[model samples]
Target: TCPFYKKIPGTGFTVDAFQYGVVEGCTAYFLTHFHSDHYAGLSKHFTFPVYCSEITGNLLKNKLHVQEQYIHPLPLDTECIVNGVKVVLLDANHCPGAVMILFYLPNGTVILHTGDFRADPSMERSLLADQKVHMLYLDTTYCSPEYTFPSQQEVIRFAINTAFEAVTLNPHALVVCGTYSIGKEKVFLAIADVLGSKVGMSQEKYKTLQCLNIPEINSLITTDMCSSLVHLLPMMQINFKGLQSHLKKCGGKYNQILAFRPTGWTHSNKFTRIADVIPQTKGNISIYGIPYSEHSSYLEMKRFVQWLKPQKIIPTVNVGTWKSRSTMEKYFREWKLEAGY
Candidate 1:
């Protein structure tokens, strides 16, 4: 999570500033995504003008009960004037409704706020090809070199194959996936398609997915535990006790369990790739930690910074301490030098 000090200096606009009520000089509010951390301060009582993508707008109204009149939905890649300041929204690969915000101030200074993103090569060509960015608010969730992990596609493929092998050995082996309210939907969805298995999810999770309006997802959901061998549970519930409790609830329908915990923090330099890693198993339960993240990897961030070559960079995440923020600054300076800035 990043600091709640969401205002950009010298501007009347605030990005993700719901937590702090009535920020000084705040005329408009911008939400980059629907994640709790980003939308933490927003509520039904909010009276300020809020701007976000169309999907995010829907989630705010449908999920949070925020009024529609105050919520403004911007078209991706199109410039819109908000309180006389030019703004643009770009697709952020982090989650369903996430976006990278671009603010063109009256002084011709281009400021970019990448809310939370998983950097992709195609983004350079499609989203930020010609913009001469002056200031950048970067998502530094995994900014350190030690946080390097393989691409999302590679990790998802690994999860699918791992689950396939385990279930092949034992058909009754229930495959469980650890996920948050959003993100990592692709991993388990791909697994379901490959295994031709139905997915079981809680009613609350199902309602959230419906808000996304993705037809492919709505077709695969099954509430009855007896109907599906695959289940989606919260990340905190992937532990041994949790898995054991889940199995007990299954009532002998499944003999064993194979679970995937997908997150970037689990990756380590000790292993070369996911192929060399092994699952941690105890008795009838086995869990695999897949290095899947919605945030950019270190190498990916380097590519983005070098290509953009912004005059200034502000770390959004891990900015609480001088040491952590300064460490990221060091890396940013080295990257800037490498880019001949």
Candidate 2:
């Protein structure tokens, strides 16, 4: 009898076993991150106990709205024994709850799985612990040599400065920005910092801040909180059509409106374009394009891999995908390994 069942064909395996079946010998399954690409198909097939970080577990259950019974939550930077394998979760820093998985086999073979990560010194230290790593699964999303991005702090600063300038220049203008509902909480914090006690957030934005545990930023009041400042609320609404009428009713007291959104057309282009057409006889409609993204750049990815110093690096969740795989392989080869692992 075979000790391990047949491997899947496209996955470099020569087996015909079902994808979800848990044989008598298998012990545990490890998930590296909560991204759709990595964890989407997991629940459908894998029947064994799955392990992930506590934040990731909450994200799966609360944000992504996945069921609770499927996940086993573990704290970051801690070691746990699962199915005879030593598993450890490390902060990934790609998103709030993202993590990297380190698996230590009984035979001393160590595997490192990096779920999409970026080099944010403020977020977490790069993987530079004194541990021997054999195999590594890398994230090569931005493998192109030309791709690059500034540090997270720098990006946040730029976005906040640009947004402030736009709002200040046109007090009667309405500003709308696009960002992820949860991932862009930093941007919201930055904006609130700039506005300080003069900024008011909607129930939805307040809830987002609460979820992120940034009450210090949410406590600030915008012009909306005051009857004298009620004019500011008109610009922050999801429905901008009422803005013109509100301005007229309020005696044209305010000259600016600001909104935030993730990097999607639904909040940025479509809504902004519509707002531009509305006859704002009193205030102007100006859009600010801020550069803030969550993914790691090509340079960041290369730096992370170099620091990890794994024996052999493999990529998952991006295999067989033309754009992702090809781009990553190019970087993997260009950033040739050093003499030591």
Candidate 3:
């Protein structure tokens, strides 16, 4: 794979290639999600026709402030012709507004581009299993066998229980859940529902979630910061200084702060149980780094590849060097061979 690896070989369509500027033969742009890395090159002045899921388009418009005329939101699970190629979008199971794209070429070749995904069991039931995918552009974010994490639901349960347990002991503690622009909705949502606590978030984050059409969240979030003890914060705000600033503004209304930092990097395979997941504590603040990753674990990725058994596999992530790319391809080669293909 070269610098233009993001560009589909047989077509003018580019998937998540916004940062690369104008590539040769590029006619249309395709975005898998609204993540900064994926949509880095997109801007208000970008004049190219961009195609993506309806939810993703709304994020680009609401969060990135991209022009609406250039954003084309397509329906999910339905095939539509784009420049004579049949294209379909399916749930990526990674983040809100994220999608795994399928391209059916004129020459009868089928390509699957999993933008960034967590290989949930539900994906096994997808209609994509029926299609004979010839090429796979996978989210190899965690392709090595050493990388593995617990399921999302389990982590959510752990987070809810942990927060609830903390609140039970320290009733005056302010609960803060950290998240990205569009991902980790489940973590805070569970804390809000299970703990029966009102959730507070930045008005901008609230507006972004509104585009997702999650109705239940509407009633749970409040515009007034003083009304909710549990708040949703950006990943950057989970730090000591950030939490301290927020706590200072409370004016002694809360005794302590319990912040949950949910990301894959926080998880280590050395842990034996969910109970083993601990927090970093400083005098009045406790930050719990949970293993709530939106990307698939190595085992999940292996299962997906074995099931799909594509004729060719092209990794879409962590491919910056020959050594790294070769290491990932080694797994793909062994998995394909083990699948008896």
Candidate 4:
């Protein structure tokens, strides 16, 4: 098979070969985001020149630890050509480095890859007009009608209220939260803003956030600051049993204990364990699941697909025949005049 035509499971049609194939004649590759699902296969195999926004490049370097040589960083909204493909990066508004790619072919065919974008009106306004998009590779992760998420501000407000309530219940309890070291700094900052204290971040995140000049958040604090205010620790160090023991020991000093997880603390089987751990603690403990997602909701996906008005729609990312295909297919049929592929 050609390097430009590689098979993707469940999709009857193959994805672009350059996306996952050996780089023999491929001219260029575009990565929409640094999410593991999108770029995981690239690093181990091909060393093709890849293009993405500068922030995306920094994120891939800081988070994924990818080498600098293979990356070709471009400023957002700038037009560039790679391997005979005209490419433009637009604000995805999903994450700091997320992008929506526009690929223009010499034949006048324009493809817009809406890589995990959400519907922030401000972000939508920042994109170039849709006059030239011939086809769209949309993100349909939550394309069903039932999936919903509260507004970012609403989620932040809820997190703040939850934290304050926990503090009130037990004044000296410690609060610990879990989030990706870099991506969820906004949520941490929001929490800090409510607590009126500096939020601690991982070393890598601290540096990246500093480069971005985020005035709202801060890195780890000195013992003096830790003693005076509520301590907000980075989620990275809370991973294993040792960290759990450490948190328990430190938490004893605080009057109230609270924690937040962007993805939530409960998985299918682990909710019971989490509940047990929270209730048994001496300090009042509460775990709040904040709605801080970097993906499009069902309505956002539907609106974007409608705006694109593609002849056919193909759903990926959890849309499989045995599980969520029917739900996804329903959205495709409703949004597009024709049936789904």
Of 2 and 4, the candidate ahead on TM-score is 4
lDDT of 2 at 65: 49
TM-score per prediction, in order, is 0.94, 0.67, 0.95, 0.75
- Candidate-wise lDDT, in order: 0.84, 0.53, 0.84, 0.58
2 or 4, greater by lDDT: 4
| lDDT for predicted candidate 2 compared with the true structure | 0.53
Q: Lowest summed-lDDT stretch of 10 residues in model 1?
A: 1-10
For candidate 1, the per-residue lDDT at 228 reads 86
Error at 133, model 4, angstroms: 2.6
Where does candidate 2 have its weakest 10-residue lDDT segment?
Answer: 7-16
Per-residue accuracy of model 4 over 267-320 as CA lDDT, tens digit each: 422233222333233334445555576777776766666655665454546644
**TM-score-superior candidate, 3 or 4:** 3
Off by over 4 Å in 4: 1-24, 42-46, 62-67, 128-132, 168-171, 204-244, 249-252, 264-283, 319-323, 338-341
Could you arrange the candidates by TM-score from highest to lowest? 3, 1, 4, 2
Residue pairs in collision within model 1: 18-41, 19-41
Give the root-mean-square deviation of each candidate in angstroms. Answer: 2.1, 8.0, 1.8, 5.9
